Amino acid sequence: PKSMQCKVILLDGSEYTCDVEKRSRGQVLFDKVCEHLNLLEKDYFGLTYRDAENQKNWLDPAKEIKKQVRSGAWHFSFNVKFYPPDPAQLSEDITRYYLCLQLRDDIVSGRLPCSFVTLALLGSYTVQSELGDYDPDECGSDYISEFRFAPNHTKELEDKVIELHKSHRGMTPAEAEMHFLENAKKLSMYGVDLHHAKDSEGVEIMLGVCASGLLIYRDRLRINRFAWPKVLKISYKRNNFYIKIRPGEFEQFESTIGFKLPNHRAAKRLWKVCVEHHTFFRLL
């Protein structure tokens, strides 16, 4: 029974290696990684792999790993797939811990934009969670944390992290993690998966997929929002992604909004992440 080596980048940046039978479905590897992580609330998470073209794709747990990675290496990352709108309702602290690690990467990467003060506040909770109570013996006027807090670090940001860290004395790791999440969950790009697209006139837009619904970022003055209920149907055809928007009360006919994606693979990928978010947040 022939087994393939799998390498998974975990949210703390370490590498987990295991073997699965070469015909294994994605669920087999995902169960092994979740057991390694002692993670029970698995529904929010998934594995990603970088494709030929080098884009992120979700490993479909129901399909063979080999038919997804195809010609590529059996290398994956462990990621949050469904960002919970209210992390206080997750049943375990370890769930909220992995969500924090993902968000820290979202922030450092610049996928999750954040004000100066919110960067410093989030940072201060991570420090409290990881080092415990503020100690001046590891902080002179010239302190720079090992912790990556932002896409661009400044001395002013490091100073503000420490000022806020001083205010958290006696906070336990679970408590600082929950405060981290209460702030992060409110940011306007929290849990937003962004896809490049063109509208039906060829104007460059971004489509965001989130718990609540669908976002079209057009210029800056114009952001359209389609709550999942309002979206009656989606589909893709060639390089095109279409959404069918409910008639308001008293109108005879649904409207169709069409988008042009870079290629057929980008259209299908957007379609599948929309279906999955629609299914997930319709049950939540």
Ligand X SMILES: CN(C)C(=O)CNc1ccccc1
How many CB atoms sit inside 10 A of residue 152's CB? 9
Q: Which is nearer to ligand X, 11 or 209 (CB)?
A: 209
Q: Is 226 in the site for ligand X (CB under 6 A)?
A: yes
Shortest distance in whole angstroms from residue 243 CB to ligand X = 12
Residues in CB range of 166: below 8 A, 6 or more apart: 134
Q: Is 213 in the site for ligand X (CB under 6 A)?
A: yes
Specify the DSSP class assigned to residue 172.
Answer: -
Residues touching ligand X, count (CB under 6 A): 10
Shortest distance in whole angstroms from residue 279 CB to ligand X = 16
Distances (CA, A) of 1 to 4, 24, 42, 247: 10, 11, 28, 55
Q: Is 16 in the site for ligand X (CB under 6 A)?
A: no
Determine the residue with CB nearest ligand X.
Answer: 213
Q: Which is nearer to ligand X, 167 or 256 (CB)?
A: 256
Q: What is the full DSSP assignment across 31-86?
A: HHHHHHHT---GGGEEEEEE-TT--EEEPPTTSBSHHHHTTS-SEEEEEESS--S-
> Which two tokens mark 95?
């769930």
Shortest distance in whole angstroms from residue 272 CB to ligand X = 18
Give the one residue of 8, 65, 157, 192 binding ligand X; rule: CB under 6 A. 192
Which positions lie near ligand X, rule CB under 6 A?
188, 192, 210, 212-215, 225-227
